[PDB]
């Protein structure tokens, strides 16, 4: 059907954007046995802040130091600056803008295709971000709800991109018909 | 059967599968100038079958669809080859891992029980210890049901041999080393000594034998007699 | 001690000890002997060992295939997806321009 | 006394407290532990400070040997030890991106 | 061209020997069955 | 490619590090030595094992 699809894509875009922004913001990416401030105790290693839990001084949070081959340096850079998660957030925002501007300027249907391309690119950036995150960590533990919020953002972004392209195809089908 | 690859590889395989399917669909269907049997459902099926090294039934004909297909094929080849190779490595050389390798390890986890003899220096060392790890061990053992305490070293070894890996017995190093080397060799000694103690030669409150036996023991130790005898 | 690049691997080869020396006929010998034994029983010696070897220490204390092993293939895959998307869009723009304006 | 710190410093402090007597830590001038020169039969190092009454007690990591136990009195060992192997750390190798 | 009993058997056999298909299911149910059997085959042959 | 990868992973899986002393006696890749002159040197020299 039609009419529902625009609302569903808008809702999905908002959900993906919110999830990814929260995930980049929060710090429950990794539960590891690190050190809170500078013994061992469980932590809240996020993208930026490793923070202490279930200890004498739980709730103390410190900025992660991402440094003490050229590949190692470049990976450390790319992971220190969460460029790929941030780029994911920005692309999701631009896709949201494209969907919003669809209601106006409806005549031109290449603005909704842009929305689709932005959402799919957001998904790809999210994948690269997860891969660099995990790889940098690798050079007992667990993943917290922030990581899975990032993952769910990826899934929803890819679904919303599919829907955007689907409705672009329908619009050009109507126009040619 | 998932053990050859880490959980992260499986997760990223699923992500890459969805990404590839979506990009194949987009790149094959979006252009109005094309209007490809490559809807979203057919794109997902293509990707799945490419991964499982099964047939195609359709192959992207455009440049862009072919780029997507090619990289997904390369990915699949490497990942499946790597799965098979690592499983071979697993099944060739078996590497059993000791669950605990230290005192602090026994302290931190709780899956495996452990306890000392009913009464002795082994018990007291924990009963009256101010050390973090030994304090924690005492806190656990003081209330352990069923009684983690045995009636005799023979009972202790029998109990550790009965339990698969649930129970760990704390005893003197020398007896532990003796037991380990005997049949059926069902047991091993892990980590270092928790404390230090010595065995010596006694002597009455005052005598002329003590002074020379001290020199004898040091001479034996230094010469290497005691190490060789042990 | 830093840079923490070494490791003690094998248990001790031989066995010796350190002791408190005193003159051959000094009255301090017996009391110091009893003091050492009392400390050893009380765990003070173990605590001092911990304090000076570990508390002042400048450091803390699978077989599956890891994502690090196959990371490059993921990078290549996503790079190829991006390239595919770019090529598609370039062709689409070219076709849009191609129609007789 | 307050100028120094170490395992032996704390051990000496505790020993003094148990025995109840003041003390003054003094390093060995020569810088050796103990050795009987075959010719002279001289004791250098803290063993010298013990045999020739120059000191009253040694609280250093002094091994309990036979050549040494003869001329002085050793307390029961306060720290057992031995020879051991030291090797470079494993240094787990990061796989290449394109390994 | 469609999955009768004999063609179903042939499809399954060929999927097990990794010997490609002349026909593959087109429906959601057929594709679920096919996909799961492909997974099974991949694990068992690798093993 | 698959067979050589399997060889790589199998070999890397059967690599045992050093765990004892006699393990130093058996191998020759890892050199080992003691202090120039001291108790450990003598211990080895007069060693009857
Ligand atoms: C026709 C089909 C299309 C085909 C091919 C498509 C094109 C493929 C391009 C992808 C290149 C990725 C890359 O080179 O990463 C580099 C950085 O490695 C790191 O330090 C990790 C950081 C990764 C970020 C890169 C994201 C790629 C996304 C992209 C969007 C790898 O390191 P290096 O410095 O390049 O080389 C030495 C590395 N080594 C010594 C460890 C082996
Ligand atoms: C999973 C399970 C597989 C289930 C079948 C896939 C959906 C098929 C949809 C479809 O073919 O209908 C039309 C599109 O329909 C849409 O617009 C789909 C809406 C978005 C759902 C995208 C899921 C894939 C994204 C990632 C999933 C995580 C297109 O075909 P048709 O020619 O209209 O008929
Ligand atoms: O009684 C003795 N006690 C010793 C105690 C120690 C230490 F462990 F550091 F406390 C050392 N260290 C070994 C490394 O070089 C010097 C420092 C040497 C000692 N030596 C000399 P040895 O002849 O080499 O044994 C003795 O004689
Ligand atoms: C006609 C349709 C065309 C389809 C086209 C898609 C097929 C792509 C396939 C494989 C790409 C593999 C890329 C290999 C990149 C490896 C480069 C590399 O890393 O080499 C340097 C090395 O790291 C130094 O140590
Ligand atoms: C387009 C329609 C295609 C239809 C779909 C075809 C089926 C896909 C193939 C395989 C499924 C494999 C399922 C894997 C199940 C994993 C179970 C698991 O992970 O449990 C282990 C546990 O996590 C450890 O503690
Ligand atoms: C196409 C198939 C989809 C895959 C289905 C996956 C079902 C199992 C998922 C298990 C997740 C376990 C969570 C791990 C916990 C952690 O260490 O973070
Ligand atoms: C073509 C893409 C699908 C391929 C099939 C992949 C399904 C496996 C996913 C399982 C999730 C990971 C859980 C297992 C790891 C673990 O818990 O040890
Ligand atoms: C065991 C598996 C089942 C074997 C086949 C059972 C026989 C059923 C009668 C089918 C007759 C042939 C029809 C056809 O060609 O589709």
Author numbering:
A (entry chain G): 5 to 42, 55 to 84, 92 to 162, 173 to 210
B (entry chain B): 517 to 551, 569 to 763
C (entry chain C): 715 to 775, 784 to 823
D (entry chain C): 418 to 516
E (entry chain A): 569 to 615
F (entry chain C): 616 to 664
Report text from the authors:
AMPA glutamate receptors (AMPARs), the primary mediators of excitatory neurotransmission in the brain, are either GluA2 subunit-containing and thus Ca2+-impermeable, or GluA2-lacking and Ca2+-permeable. AMPA glutamate receptors (AMPARs) mediate rapid signalling throughout the brain, and orchestrate various forms of synaptic plasticity that underlie learning. These cation channels assemble in various combinations from four core subunits, GluA1–4, with each contributing unique gating kinetics, trafficking and subsynaptic localization. AMPARs exhibit a modular architecture with a two-layer extracellular region connected to the transmembrane ion channel (transmembrane domain, TMD). The ion channel is encircled by diverse auxiliary subunits, modulating receptor gating kinetics, pharmacology and ion flux, with the transmembrane AMPAR regulatory proteins (TARPs γ2, γ3, γ4, γ5, γ7, γ8) being the most abundant.
